[PDB]
Amino acid sequence: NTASIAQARKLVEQLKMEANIDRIKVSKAAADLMAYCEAHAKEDPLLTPVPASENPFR
């Protein structure tokens, strides 16, 4: 019916929109994750154990 053709057009224009997502090297994302995990490490009281003085669950 008309609904089937409408869904076909919708998926066509969705897939066409999927064809341009300015694909970039994944190594940049890995380097960004590296920098974020390295710089933002001191203020995480889960990986680095914290003394009981600065702990509110004592």
């Binding site: 897939l15 064809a19 090297k25 890995a30 590296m34 889960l46 990986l47 669950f57």
Partner: protein
């Protein structure tokens, strides 16, 4: 026509997969090995809350890292404080089965839902009187799964009608429907930026959704099972998904391809909940094997086991400041770890 559509829906998928493959040249496991491992973790529970009646499904941390909520089959919603193991309010409601909890950024509104197909919000900070109903939401012919607040005025949610919907408290009208999913949708998470959000379905697929224009932004590869829970990196460029295939994977937004495979020979039970830490180095997954597991998100190496639960775990969350983790299981027990 139909045959032309089927024929055209093949080379486009082939070219999309080729573009995805061409972007990848080295996964995460090949670049994170010179960093020293986290090491053994001996985290133990500091206090047990044990204030519930039956199996629980949902939990959510507050904005100030002090209050949290939970729901059970008893039909009672209780606002819960961890500093002094006390409680503030107890909320009874019509439907005895609810599987959704949500705490607004501002400590004012709390939303609950289930298979009753009615979404009800509650005004905690009432003007003059006790806490009562504020506004009901209807329009979905399927069971609600989960909802997450976006602002104090608007709210997004997912239901069993294989579609997602966002609702405005004013006029209570479905502004923009989210269609394009075949199977039921049973997971939904938001992002620090109030413009993008993703959801997972039971057809082994996840979709990137835009709040404003209501147009699906990105598709995702298969997961070989039905997605149970999802989360989002605080950075806003990645997220982790779970399923019943006893595996967890991390998908980054920019690349749109899985980079991490979390699989162990011993584990065969499925995943139930997934959450991240503050820094982004550790993520916790609530396993079906009567316990919870930690995972060094930067590599493939278990870093300890948070055993101590006598029943299946359902919900698990991490506070905003990233200094505590809470888990909930079907034995009506709440366990929080330092």
């Amino acid at each position: 026509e139909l045959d032309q559509l089927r024929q055209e829906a093949e080379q486009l998928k082939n070219q999309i997969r080729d573009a995805r493959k061409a972007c990848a040249d080295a996964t995460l496991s090949q670049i994170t090995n010179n960093i020293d491992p986290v090491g053994r973790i001996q985290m133990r529970t500091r206090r047990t809350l044990r204030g519930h009646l039956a199996k629980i499904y949902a939990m959510h941390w507050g904005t100030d890292s002090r209050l949290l909520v939970s729901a059970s089959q008893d039909g009672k919603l209780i606002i819960w404080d961890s500093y002094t193991t006390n409680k503030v309010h107890a909320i009874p409601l019509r439907s005895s089965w609810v599987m959704t909890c949500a705490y607004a950024p501002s400590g004012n509104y709390v939303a609950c839902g289930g298979l009753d197909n009615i979404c009800s919000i509650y005004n905690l900070k009432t003007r003059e009187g006790n806490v009562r109903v504020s506004r009901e939401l209807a329009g979905h012919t399927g069971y609600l799964s989960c909802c997450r607040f976006l602002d104090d005025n608007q709210i997004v949610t997912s239901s069993g009608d294989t579609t997602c919907a966002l609702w405005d408290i004013e006029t209570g009208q479905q502004t923009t429907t989210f269609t394009g999913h075949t199977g039921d949708v049973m997971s939904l998470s938001l992002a620090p930026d109030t413009r993008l959000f993703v959801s997972g379905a039971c057809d082994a697929s996840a979709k990137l959704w835009d709040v404003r224009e209501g147009m699906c932004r990105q598709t995702f590869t298969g997961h070989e099972s039905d997605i149970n829970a999802i989360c989002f990196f605080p950075n806003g460029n990645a997220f982790a998904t779970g399923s019943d295939d006893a595996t967890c994977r991390l998908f980054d937004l920019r690349a749109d391809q899985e980079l991490m495979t979390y699989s162990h020979d011993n584990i065969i039970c499925g995943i139930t909940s997934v959450s991240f830490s503050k820094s982004g180095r550790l993520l916790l997954a609530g396993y079906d094997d009567f316990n919870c597991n930690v995972w060094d998100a930067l590599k493939a190496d278990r870093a300890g086991v948070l055993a101590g639960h006598d029943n299946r775990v359902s919900c698990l969350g991490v506070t905003d400041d990233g200094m505590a983790v809470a888990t909930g299981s079907w034995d009506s027990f709440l366990k929080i770890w330092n």
